[PDB]
Structure formats: C-alpha cells, structure tokens
Ligand binder design. Structure first.
Ligand SMILES: CC(=O)N[C@@H]1[C@@H](O)[C@H](O[C@@H]2O[C@H](CO)[C@@H](O[C@@H]3O[C@H](CO)[C@@H](O[C@@H]4O[C@H](CO)[C@@H](O[C@@H]5O[C@H](CO)[C@@H](O)[C@H](O)[C@H]5NC(C)=O)[C@H](O)[C@H]4NC(C)=O)[C@H](O)[C@H]3NC(C)=O)[C@H](O)[C@H]2NC(C)=O)[C@@H](CO)O[C@H]1O
Ligand SMILES: *[C@@H]1O[C@H](CO)[C@@H](O[C@@H]2O[C@H](CO)[C@@H](O)[C@H](O)[C@H]2NC(C)=O)[C@H](O)[C@H]1NC(C)=O
Length: 326
C-alpha cells in the first residue's frame, strides 16, 4: 500500500494519483450530534482528480484529525444510541460524496475510550462491509498515548489497515533540545531517547498486532524549524541547545528558506537536518534519502505499506513521493 493523506494545500495532480493505492482526504469533522461537516471544495476536487487519473485508487475521508476535540469522539462512541446514528451518518456520507471508505483520526483516545473505540470501529466496519468500503484508523507513536488508549488487537480485528503516525517526535512542546521530527532509528550513543523514532514505534505495533500486513508506517512530507539554536548538547549536532520554536514547513517550501546543500544526513538515525551556523536556524525534515531508507525498512520488516502525511506538501516534481514510489 501507498496511503496518501491530502490536506488541500494545492491540487492533486494526475501523476500523484497514479502513485497511490489510497488517497485519504483530510478532514471532515463530526459535530456533537454526529453530523459530518460537508466535504470542502478543495477535497472534492481531489476526489475527482484522483479517480479520473487512477481508476484503481480508493478515495477515503479522514474524520477528526489533530485539531479536533477528542471529547466529541468519546461522546459519540460511548453511547450505543449515538454510536449507531453516527455510524449510519458516516455510511450515508460515503454514499452521498462518492467515497470508498473512511479513516478515523482520533487524537487521542484515553484509557476510558479504549474499549468503546474498538466497539465503534467493529460496528462501523459491519455497516461498511456490503459496499466494500475501506476502514482505517490513525495510531499514535509513543507509549504515553498507545498504552492507555489503543487496544491494537481489537482495533486490528475491525479495520482494513492501521496508519501509524511515525512523526512529531519533537515539536513545539519540546523543552530539552532540538531533535528529529521523524528519524528512522535511535541516533547512537548521543541520542537521549530510545523511543522517539519510527523503528521503536513500529516495533511496538509489531509486538501487539496479529498480522503486520495490516500496518502502514507513516512518513512526513514536512519538517520543523527552530531559531536562535546553539551548540550540540553532547557532541552531536542533531540535539542542540534551544532556541525558539519556528513552525512546521512543507517540503515544497523548505528550499526557498534554507540552503539544502547544507543538509546533514545522520547516518545512524537516518534523518536529515540543517544547522545554519550563519543564522542559527535549525531544520529537521525528511528528504529523498530518508524516505528511501524508510521504504527499505518497510520492505525488510514485512510491514503492509507506507502512509504519507501529506502528499500535497511534496514539491511540484514529486521528489518525495517519487522516492517512496521508485
Ligand atoms: C506536556 C508534554 O510535554 N507532553 C508530552 C507530549 O506532548 C508528547 O507527545 C506528543 O504530543 C503531541 C501533542 O499532542 C503530538 O503531536 C500531535 O500529534 C498528532 C499525531 O501525530 C498530529 O496530528 C496528525 O499529524 C499531522 C501532522 O502533525 C496533523 O497535521 C496537521 O493537521 C492540522 C489540522 O488537524 C493542520 O492545521 C496542520 O497544518 C497539520 N500539520 C501539518 C504539519 O501538516 C494531522 O492533523 C494529524 N493527522 C491525522 C491522521 O490524524 C498533531 O499535529 C501533533 N500536534 C502538534 C501540535 O504538533 C505528538 O504526536 C506526540 N508525540 C509522540 C511521539 O507521541 C509525549 C511523547 O513524547 O510526551 C509528553 O510528555
Ligand atoms: C529497532 O528497534 C528494535 C526494538 O526496539 C531494536 O531491537 C532491539 O535491540 C536491542 C539492543 O539495542 C535488543 O536488546 C532487543 O532485544 C531488540 N528487540 C527486538 C524486539 O528485536 C533494534 O536494534 C532497532 N534497530 C536499530 C537500527 O536501532
């Protein structure tokens, strides 16, 4: 599988559509009653572009998302009556909007949600099964969220695949140092963390699920910046004194603001970063090399596919998607 999430940053091109097996439009959100927000114009355009260019492509709607209040999912899913009506609305929405499935993006289920989340996904799949609509969900990357909220065997028993979000390992909340948004591995002896890497997150999933073919390893087409960054903490320039958080930058916008010839490729972590000694700017990101190393890992581990957040962040020449694709 090559599962591409899509945010409406720019049109979906005919070339992109052919490189995916699944296109996940993001997002629709439910209200407190379980009514889904209408599909936006930019997302509807991508549905049409995708199906026109690739008649095998499955176009799905992601429901929820990182900005969406998880207490609304709690409310809808915990009451058997509202669960039923929410599910019926989801299935009606797929029909009305000519969609092939849906992704539940609940950020994040708590310990009180763990069992009802599984019931919701099981009951949703039952309602979707006659039409063959594809069901997926997005899963977290650290034990902090995974252990309380995610019964991975129960989830697996309901869904067609699990989109594992192996990114956002460092970010605006980080107080200790710079670090990689999405490395493949722990970065050697200077790395202060054993777990903030894609390999740890995927291994956690591999030890819990029955069939690893049901997993997709998520990869980001964006990176993150800090400014006023200082010296390495322990001899390795990936982890540097802070500094002020910048923002999340799509790949397509990085090279206009950073000199990409200064890229450092961390050979142990398999991650790309730039520290600019003239400006003290820092950029952690994924590039063609990091994605090639990640695709190789997915194949080596027998993981069922690669998920991308998000394909519209790629440049006009599809540097990132072609690296995953080729
Ligand atoms: C207090 C403290 O220190 N606590 C930490 C705790 O923070 C650590 O965990 C980390 O927490 C953060 C914040 O909760 C997590 O960051 C979330 O993670 C979400 C899942 O990865 C992520 O959403 C998914 O990923 C996409 C990219 O981030 C999202 O895209 C964004 O969507 C927006 C609309 O919804 C849009 O406006 C944005 O432009 C867009 N961004 C980009 C770059 O495209 C997307 O919504 C979502 N996709 C899906 C399929 O659901 C959140 O965006 C991200 N939040 C922020 C604010 O950046 C982070 O994942 C946690 N890390 C780990 C490893 O689990 C915790 C562990 O270190 O420790 C505690 O101590
Ligand atoms: C990828 O992650 C796995 C699991 O965390 C690592 O394998 C572990 O390696 C440690 C030594 O560092 C062993 O003590 C464990 O027994 C291993 N666990 C499993 C489940 O195999 C693996 O080394 C990581 N790969 C890289 C390149 O860092």
């Amino acid at each position: 599988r090559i599962v591409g999430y899509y945010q409406g940053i720019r049109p979906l091109t005919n070339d992109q559509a052919k490189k995916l097996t699944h296109l996940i439009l993001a997002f629709s959100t439910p209200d407190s009653q379980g009514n889904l927000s209408p599909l936006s114009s930019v997302l509807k355009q991508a549905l049409k572009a995708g199906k026109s260019a690739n008649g095998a492509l499955k176009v799905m709607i992601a429901i929820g998302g990182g900005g969406f209040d998880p207490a609304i999912f709690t409310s809808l899913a915990s009451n058997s009556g509202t669960r039923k009506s929410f599910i019926n609305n989801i299935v009606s929405y797929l029909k009305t909007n000519e969609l092939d499935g849906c992704d539940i993006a609940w950020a994040f289920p708590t310990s009180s949600d763990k069992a009802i989340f599984v019931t919701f996904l099981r009951d949703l799949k039952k309602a979707m099964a006659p039409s063959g609509a594809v069901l997926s969900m997005a899963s977290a990357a650290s034990a902090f969220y995974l252990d309380p909220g995610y019964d991975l065997p129960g989830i697996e028993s309901a869904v067609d695949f699990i989109n594992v979000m192996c990114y956002d390992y460092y970010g605006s909340w980080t107080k200790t140092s710079t670090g990689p948004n999405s490395p493949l591995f722990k970065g050697g002896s200077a790395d202060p963390s054993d777990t903030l890497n894609s390999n740890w997150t995927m291994n956690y999933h591999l030890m819990k699920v029955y069939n690893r073919a049901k997993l997709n390893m998520g990869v980001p087409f964006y990176g993150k910046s800090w400014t006023n960054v200082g010296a390495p903490l322990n001899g390795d320039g990936l982890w540097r004194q802070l500094g002020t958080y910048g923002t999340e930058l799509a790949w397509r916008n990085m090279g206009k603001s950073f000199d990409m010839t200064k890229t450092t490729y961390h050979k142990t972590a398999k991650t790309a970063y730039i520290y600019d000694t003239a400006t003290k700017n820092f950029l952690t990101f994924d590039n063609p090399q990091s994605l090639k190393d990640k695709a190789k890992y997915v194949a080596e581990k027998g993981i069922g596919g690669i998920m991308i957040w998000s394909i519209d962040q790629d440049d006009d020449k599809l540097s990132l998607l072609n690296s995953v694709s080729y």
